[PDB]
Every structure is written in C-alpha cells, then in structure tokens.
Design a protein around this ligand. Sequence first.
Ligand SMILES: CC1(C)C=C(CSSP(=O)(O)OP(=O)(O)OC[C@H]2O[C@@H](n3cnc4c(N)ncnc43)[C@H](O)[C@@H]2O)C(C)(C)N1O
Length: 183
Amino acid sequence: IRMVPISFVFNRFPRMVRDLAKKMNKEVNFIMRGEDTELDRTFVEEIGEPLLHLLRNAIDHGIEPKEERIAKGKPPIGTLILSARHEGNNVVIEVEDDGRGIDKEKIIRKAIEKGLIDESKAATLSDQEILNFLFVPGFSVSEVSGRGVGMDVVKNVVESLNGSISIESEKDKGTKVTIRLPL
Ligand SMILES: CC1(C)C=C(CSSP(=O)(O)OP(=O)(O)OC[C@H]2O[C@@H](n3cnc4c(N)ncnc43)[C@H](O)[C@@H]2O)C(C)(C)N1O
C-alpha cells in the first residue's frame, strides 16, 4: 500500500472545468489547493469521478451568469476551489463555489411532498440534515436520459471508504461540499 500525491487526480480537472465552464457561457475562476497531500493509490483513483460531479454542479448550477450575478455586488467572475488538506488522521477534500446557493426550504418542500418526512417535524431536522436530502435517490418519465450522474454515487464512494460527505450552503453566498477520508 503505497501513497502518491493528490496531485495525480486533481491535475486532471482544470481542463474539464474550463471545458464545462465554456459549455454554459459562464466564466469561472478555478483554484486548486493542497495538491501535495497524499492518499493511497486506491483512495485517489476512486474520488475523481465523485469529485468531478461536485465540480460540475458549481459551474453548471452553482455559479451565476454575469448579468444576474453582477447585480448582487459579487464580483462578475465566479470562483471555484478544490482543496485537500492533511488534518489529523483524516484526509479532507473540499470543493467550494461563490454561487447561487442551494435554497434549503426547496429541499424541505420536496421532503414533505414525497413523504420522506412530514411537515410538523420539519423543525426537527438541522440545516446539516436538510442537504442530506440531496442524498436520497431520485430527489432530482416521458423522457429519460439513459445516462445519469446522481449525487449519491458520490455519497457512496465516500461511504464506501469509511468516509463522510457533507454539504454546507448559504443562499446567494455559495455552497461547499466536504469529503473526509481516513489515513
Ligand atoms: C430541473 C433541473 C435542475 C434538474 C435536471 C435534472 S436533475 S439530475 P442531477 O444530477 O443534476 O441532480 P443533482 O443530484 O445534481 O442535484 C442538483 C440539485 O441540488 C442542488 N445543487 C446541487 N449542487 C449545487 C450547487 N453547487 N449549487 C447550487 N445548487 C446545487 C441544485 O439546486 C439542484 O436542485 C435538469 C438539468 C433538467 N434541470 O434543469
């Protein structure tokens, strides 16, 4: 069991982010931090596709268009950060964007409609719990893209390796997703 820098995976994404950024007419700023931290050849190879998902949404859905984005006083060029820091005995990766932000009450209104939870205990769940509703399958008939990137696939890889994904978000201030990994 042999460890190689997290550079191996991270370095692939910039080309993609640029690619994906250009498809939806959005200019983005991509920052990668902590490339030197190291994980086992296994742990690195798995997370790429999971990480790739989290990046895409930020460009795709996280970062606003210039005209609407320029209005709020935030700089016109959105910023996307992928970082890995070696803290303690756990390896944590984070992806953050200065984006629209996930509207937490939209997730709460979806859990009630679909019966995941009833409304009167909505007060029970914590903000941290609300976004976990992004992890139920099919939270997202006539038409079906035979090809589908789901959020859970990520939750799984993380859960696969004894690891915990998390989502923190603040409407119109941005969202950040975090992946803690052991050893
Ligand atoms: C109606 C909608 C959106 C659904 C589609 C199919 S949906 S399949 P999908 O894989 O896209 O669904 P996701 O499992 O990706 O969840 C995406 C859900 O989470 C939140 N969200 C996740 N990351 C976020 C981020 N960085 N910034 C802000 N919001 C984020 C989003 O507001 C969204 O509501 C298509 C593309 C046709 N379409 O126009």
